[PDB]
Amino acid sequence: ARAKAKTRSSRAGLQFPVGRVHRLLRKGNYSERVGAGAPVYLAAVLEYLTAEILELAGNAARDNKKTRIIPRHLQLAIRNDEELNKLLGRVTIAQGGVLPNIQAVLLPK
Amino acid sequence: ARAKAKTRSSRAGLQFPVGRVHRLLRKGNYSERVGAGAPVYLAAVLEYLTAEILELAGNAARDNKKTRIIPRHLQLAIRNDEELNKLLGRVTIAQGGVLPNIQAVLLPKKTESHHKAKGK
Amino acid sequence: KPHRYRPGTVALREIRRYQKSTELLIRKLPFQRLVREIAQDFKTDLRFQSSAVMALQEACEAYLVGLFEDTNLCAIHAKRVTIMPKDIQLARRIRGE
Amino acid sequence: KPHRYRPGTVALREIRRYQKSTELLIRKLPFQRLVREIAQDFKTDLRFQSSAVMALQEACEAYLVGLFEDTNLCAIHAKRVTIMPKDIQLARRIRGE
Amino acid sequence: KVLRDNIQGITKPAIRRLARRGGVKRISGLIYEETRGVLKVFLENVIRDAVTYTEHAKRKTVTAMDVVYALKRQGRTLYGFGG
Amino acid sequence: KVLRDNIQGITKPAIRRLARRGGVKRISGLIYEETRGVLKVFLENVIRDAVTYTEHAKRKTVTAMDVVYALKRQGRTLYGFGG
Amino acid sequence: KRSRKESYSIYVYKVLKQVHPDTGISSKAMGIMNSFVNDIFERIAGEASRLAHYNKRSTITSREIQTAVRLLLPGELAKHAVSEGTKAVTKYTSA
Amino acid sequence: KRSRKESYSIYVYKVLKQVHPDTGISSKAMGIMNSFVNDIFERIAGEASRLAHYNKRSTITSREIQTAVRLLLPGELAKHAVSEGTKAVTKYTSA
Amino acid sequence: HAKPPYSYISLITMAIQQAPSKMLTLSEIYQWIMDLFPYYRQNQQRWQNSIRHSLSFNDCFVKVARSPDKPGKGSYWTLHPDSGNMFENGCYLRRQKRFKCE
DNA sequence: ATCTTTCCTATTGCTTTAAAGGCAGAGGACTGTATTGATCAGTCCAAACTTCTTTCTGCATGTACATGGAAAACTGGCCAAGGCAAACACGTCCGGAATGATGGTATTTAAGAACAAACATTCCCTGGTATCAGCAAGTACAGTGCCCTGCTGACAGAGCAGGAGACACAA
DNA sequence: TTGTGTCTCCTGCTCTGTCAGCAGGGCACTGTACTTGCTGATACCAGGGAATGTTTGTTCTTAAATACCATCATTCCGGACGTGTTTGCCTTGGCCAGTTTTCCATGTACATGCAGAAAGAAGTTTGGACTGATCAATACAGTCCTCTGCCTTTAAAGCAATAGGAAAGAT
Phi, psi (deg, nearest 5) at residue I85: -85, 65
Q: What distance in Å separates the CA atoms of residue F43 and residue F70, rounded to the nearest whole number?
A: 11
**CA–C1' I96–K5 (A):** 30
Phi, psi (deg, nearest 5) at residue I60: -70, -10
3-state DSSP call for residue H24? strand
Q: What distance in Å separates the CA atoms of residue A78 and residue A55, rounded to the nearest whole number?
A: 11
Count of residues making up chain B: 120
Beta-carbon contacts of residue D95 (< 8 Å; ≥ 6 apart): C94, C95, C96, D70
Write out residues 21-80 of E within 8 Å (CB-CB) of H: 77, 79-80
Q: Which of residues 59-98 of I touch strand K (CB under 7 A)?
A: 72-73, 93-98
3-state DSSP call for residue E24? coil
Strands (E), chain D: 47-48, 82-83
Provide the total of helices (H) and of strands (E) in chain A, helices listed first: 5, 3
Q: Look up the protein residue whose alpha carbon has the minimum distance to the C1' of J5.
A: C3
3-state DSSP call for residue F57? coil
Sign (positive or negative) of CA dihedral D17, D23, D27, D33: positive
Long-range contacts of C71-76 (CB under 8 A, 24+ apart): C71/E19, C71/E22, C71/E24, C72/A103, C72/E19, C72/E22, C72/E23, C72/E24, C72/E25, C73/A103, C73/D90, C73/D93, C73/D94, C74/D74, C74/D77, C74/D90, C74/D94, C75/E24, C76/A103, C76/A105, C76/A106
**How big is chain G by its Cα radius of gyration, in Å?**
16
Q: Are the Cβ atoms of D22 and B103 closer than 8 angstroms?
A: no
Phi, psi (deg, nearest 5) at residue C19: -75, -10
CATH 1.10.20.10 fits E1-83, yes or no: yes
Q: Which amino acid is at B96?
A: G
Beta-carbon contacts of residue B5 (< 8 Å; ≥ 6 apart): none
Phi, psi (deg, nearest 5) at residue I6: -135, 135
Q: What distance in Å separates the CA atoms of residue G36 and residue G56, rounded to the nearest whole number?
A: 30
- How many other CB atoms sit within 10 Å of the CB of residue B66? 16
Pairs of CB atoms within 8 A across B/D: 41
Method of determination used here: cryo-EM
Q: Which CATH number is H2-95 given? A: 1.10.20.10
Q: What distance in Å separates the CA atoms of residue B28 and residue D51, rounded to the nearest whole number?
A: 26
Strands (E), chain B: 33-34, 68-69, 91-93
**CA–C1' B20–K55 (A):** 8
Give the closest residue to D88 by CA, choosing from F21, B106, A101, C77: C77
Beta-carbon contacts of residue E69 (< 8 Å; ≥ 6 apart): E49, E50, E53, G50, G54
Closest chain F CA to residue G29: F80
CA atoms within 13 A on the CB side of F13: 2
Concatenating the DSSP letter of every residue in I28-89 gives HHHHHHHHH-GGGGS-HHHHHHHHHHHHHH-TTEEEE--TT--S-SS-EEEE-TT--STT-S
CA atoms within 13 A on the CB side of H87: 12
Closest chain C CA to residue D92: C94
Q: What distance in Å separates the CA atoms of residue H94 and residue H86, rounded to the nearest whole number?
A: 12
Phi, psi (deg, nearest 5) at residue B108: -65, 150
Return positions of chain K under 7 A from a protein CB.
14-21, 24-27, 31-35, 44-46, 52-58, 63-65, 74-77, 85-87, 93-97, 101-110, 115-118, 125-130, 136-138, 143-150, 156-157, 168-171
Q: What distance in Å separates the CA atoms of residue E38 and residue B89, rounded to the nearest whole number?
A: 20
**CA–C1' F23–K23 (A):** 35
Q: What distance in Å separates the CA atoms of residue G88 and residue E8, rounded to the nearest whole number?
A: 45
**What secondary structure, in 3-state letters, does C67-90 show?**
HHHHHHHHHHHCCCCEECHHHHHH
Q: What distance in Å separates the CA atoms of residue A70 and residue C95, rounded to the nearest whole number?
A: 30
Burial class (CB in 10 A: 0-12, 13-18, 19+), E23: buried
Largest separation between any pair of C-alpha atoms in chain B: 95
CA atoms within 13 A on the CB side of H94: 9
Q: What distance in Å separates the CA atoms of residue D90 and residue C95, rounded to the nearest whole number?
A: 11
Structural contact between residues H20 and A55, judged by C-beta atoms closer than 8 angstroms: yes
Count of residues making up chain I: 102
Q: Which of residues 78-97 of D touch strand K (CB under 7 A)?
A: 82
Structural contact between residues D26 and D58, judged by C-beta atoms closer than 8 angstroms: no
Using a CB-CB distance cutoff of 8 angstroms, which residues of chain B are in contact with residue H49?
29
Q: What distance in Å separates the CA atoms of residue B69 and residue D30, rounded to the nearest whole number?
A: 31
Give the closest residue to D88 by CA, choosing from G24, F42, E65, F69: F42
State how far residue H51 is from chain F, nearest Cα, in angstroms: 8
Annotated resolution, angstroms: 2.9
Q: What distance in Å separates the CA atoms of residue E38 and residue E47, rounded to the nearest whole number?
A: 14
Give the closest residue to D19 by CA, choosing from G53, B106, I86, C46: B106
Closest chain D CA to residue B75: D22
D19 touches strand J (CB under 7 A): no
Give the closest residue to D83 by CA, choosing from F28, A67, A42, F38: F28
- Taking CA atoms, A81 is separated from A51, A57, A77, C66, H19, in Å, by 14, 11, 6, 19, 17
Burial class (CB in 10 A: 0-12, 13-18, 19+), C24: middle
Q: What distance in Å separates the CA atoms of residue I12 and residue I14, rounded to the nearest whole number?
A: 5
Q: What distance in Å separates the CA atoms of residue F53 and residue E16, rounded to the nearest whole number?
A: 48
Phi, psi (deg, nearest 5) at residue D22: -115, -5
Task: Kindly state the helix (H) or strand (E) to which residue F61 belongs, with its residue range.
Answer: strand F61-62
Q: Look up the protein residue whose alpha carbon has the minimum distance to the C1' of K148.
A: H4
Give the closest residue to D71 by CA, choosing from F22, C36, E23: F22
- Taking CA atoms, B85 is separated from B79, C93, D73, in Å, by 5, 15, 20
* Pair type for strands I61-64 and I76-79: antiparallel
DSSP label at residue B33 = E
Find which nucleotide's C1' atom is closest to B68's CA: J130
CATH fold, domain D15-97, is Histone, subunit A (1.10.20)
Residues of G at the E interface (Cβ-Cβ below 8 Å)?
47, 50-51, 54-55, 63-64, 67, 70-71
Chains that touch D (3 or more CB pairs under 8 A): B, C, F
Structural contact between residues D20 and B100, judged by C-beta atoms closer than 8 angstroms: yes
Q: What distance in Å separates the CA atoms of residue G61 and residue B105, rounded to the nearest whole number?
A: 53
Beta-carbon contacts of residue C65 (< 8 Å; ≥ 6 apart): A98, E18, E21, E22
* Pair type for strands E78-79 and G24-25: unpaired
- Taking CA atoms, F77 is separated from B84, B93, D63, F68, I33, in Å, by 15, 9, 11, 7, 77
CATH fold, domain I8-79, is Arc Repressor Mutant, subunit A (1.10.10)
Largest separation between any pair of C-alpha atoms in chain A: 83
Give the closest residue to B38 by CA, choosing from G34, G48, G46: G48
DSSP label at residue I24 = B
B27 touches strand J (CB under 7 A): no
Q: What distance in Å separates the CA atoms of residue C73 and residue D85, rounded to the nearest whole number?
A: 15
Q: Which of residues 2-21 of I touch strand J (CB under 7 A)?
A: none
State how far residue H31 is from chain E, nearest Cα, in angstroms: 5
3-state DSSP call for residue F44? helix
What end-to-end distance do the CA atoms of chain C give, in Å? Answer: 50
Give the closest residue to A108 by CA, choosing from E20, C2, C10, C75: C10
Give the distance from CA G45 to its chain's centroid.
9
Concatenating the DSSP letter of every residue in A22-75 gives HHHHHHTTS-SEE-SHHHHHHHHHHHHHHHHHHHHHHHHHHHTT-SEE-HHHHH
Pairs of CB atoms within 8 A across E/G: 21
Give the distance from CA G55 to its chain's centroid.
23
Beta-carbon contacts of residue H78 (< 8 Å; ≥ 6 apart): H69, H70, H72
Q: If you classify domain B1-107 with CATH, what class do you get?
A: mainly alpha
Task: Kindly state the helix (H) or strand (E) to which residue I17 belongs, with its residue range.
Answer: helix I8-18
Find which nucleotide's C1' atom is closest to E25's CA: J81
B113 touches strand J (CB under 7 A): no
Structural contact between residues F19 and D68, judged by C-beta atoms closer than 8 angstroms: yes
Beta-carbon contacts of residue C9 (< 8 Å; ≥ 6 apart): A108
Please, do chains G and D touch (3+ CB pairs < 8 Å)?
A: no
A5 touches strand K (CB under 7 A): yes
What residues form DSSP beta bridges with F27?
A: D83
- How many other CB atoms sit within 10 Å of the CB of residue E56? 21
Using a CB-CB distance cutoff of 8 angstroms, which residues of chain G are in contact with residue A30?
none
Give the distance from CA C12 to its chain's centroid.
17
**CA–C1' F17–K30 (A):** 30
Q: Render the burial of I7-23: b for 16+ CB within 10 Å, e for the rest.
A: bebbbbbbbbeebeeeb
Among E24, E43, E78, the residue with its CB nearest the CB of C58 is: E78
Using a CB-CB distance cutoff of 8 angstroms, which residues of chain A are in contact with residue E81?
94
The alpha helices in H1-95, defined as continuous H runs, are 9-19, 27-54, 62-72, 75-93
**What secondary structure, in 3-state letters, does chain G show?**
CCCCCCCCHHHHHHHHHHHCCCCEECHHHHHHHHHHHHHHHHHHHHHHHHHHHHCCCCEECHHHHHHHHHHHCCCHHHHHHHHHHHHHHHHHHHC
Give the closest residue to E67 by CA, choosing from C55, A36, F25: C55
3-state DSSP call for residue F42? helix
Structural contact between residues D56 and F43, judged by C-beta atoms closer than 8 angstroms: yes
State how far residue B91 is from chain F, nearest Cα, in angstroms: 5
User: Does residue B32 sit at the A interface (CB-CB below 8 Å)?
Assistant: yes
Concatenating the DSSP letter of every residue in chain C gives ----PPTTHHHHHHHHHHHT--S--S-HHHHHHHHHHHHTTTSTT-EE-HHHHHHHHHHHHHHHHHHHHHHHHHHHHTT-SEE-HHHHHHHHHHHT-
- Residue from H8, H11, H66 to probe the interface with A (highest A Cβ count within 10 Å): H11
What end-to-end distance do the CA atoms of chain I give, in Å? Answer: 40
User: Does residue B103 sit at the A interface (CB-CB below 8 Å)?
Assistant: no
Q: Which amino acid is at E4?
A: R
Q: Are the Cβ atoms of F56 and H63 closer than 8 angstroms?
A: yes
What end-to-end distance do the CA atoms of chain E give, in Å? Answer: 32
Please, do chains F and B touch (3+ CB pairs < 8 Å)?
A: yes
Cα angle G70-G75-G77, degrees, rounded to a multiple of 5: 70
Q: Are the Cβ atoms of D73 and C79 closer than 8 angstroms?
A: no
Structural contact between residues I78 and I62, judged by C-beta atoms closer than 8 angstroms: yes
What residues form DSSP beta bridges with E27?
A: C83
Structural contact between residues C19 and C68, judged by C-beta atoms closer than 8 angstroms: no
Q: What distance in Å separates the CA atoms of residue G54 and residue G67, rounded to the nearest whole number?
A: 13
Beta-carbon contacts of residue A93 (< 8 Å; ≥ 6 apart): A71, A74, A75, A78, E79, E80, H32
Q: What distance in Å separates the CA atoms of residue I11 and residue A15, rounded to the nearest whole number?
A: 109
Sign (positive or negative) of CA dihedral F76, F81, G3, G4: positive
F13 touches strand J (CB under 7 A): yes
Q: Which of residues 30-89 of A touch strand K (CB under 7 A)?
A: 33-37, 61, 66-68
Give the distance from CA I39 to its chain's centroid.
16
Give the closest residue to C51 by CA, choosing from H36, A90, E54, E83: E83
Four-CA torsion F26, F30, F32, F38, nearest 10 degrees: -110
Burial class (CB in 10 A: 0-12, 13-18, 19+), A71: buried
